[PDB]
Design a protein around this ligand. Structure first.
Ligand SMILES: COc1ccccc1CNC(=O)Cn1c(CCC(=O)O)nc2c(Cl)cccc2c1=O
Ligand SMILES: [Zn+2]
Ligand SMILES: [Zn+2]
Ligand SMILES: [Zn+2]
Length: 99
């Protein structure tokens, strides 16, 4: 992954409610291949399901999303995975909730 991207400034604090890696897609309710938005922490499905997270990106401009499958972070603008110390809080909480 990239060690940095200019959109990490948009990563927001984790809700103290925490993360639910089994939360369904906010639009279609699928339990498959969801992503969480690291700006507003809405959960939407990936492009191989119904593409609701890509739609969310298009209608919000929010850049960075985290996979509830493998905890990788995707930037829609950079079209790359990103990993940085700024993502470690969210990844560690997601990992604890998942495993
Ligand atoms: C942990 O990996 C995955 C986890 C679950 C499902 C698929 C993958 C493969 N990884 C991706 O699908 C990453 N990605 C995304 C993610 C956001 C989305 O699915 O909305 N959008 C792209 C888009 Cl929008 C265009 C081109 C490439 C990608 C891309 O590779
Ligand atoms: Zn969906
Ligand atoms: Zn968002
Ligand atoms: Zn970026």
């Amino acid at each position: 992954p990239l060690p940095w991207c200019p959109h990490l400034v948009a990563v927001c604090p984790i809700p103290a409610a925490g993360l639910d890696v089994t939360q369904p897609c906010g639009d279609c309710g699928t339990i498959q291949e969801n992503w969480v938005c690291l700006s507003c922490y809405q959960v939407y499905c990936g492009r191989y399901i119904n593409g609701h997270m890509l739609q969310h990106h298009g209608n919000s401009g929010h850049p960075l999303v985290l996979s509830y499958i493998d905890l990788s972070a995707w930037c829609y603008y950079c079209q790359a995975y990103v990993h940085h110390q700024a993502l470690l809080d969210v990844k560690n909480i997601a990992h604890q909730n998942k495993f």
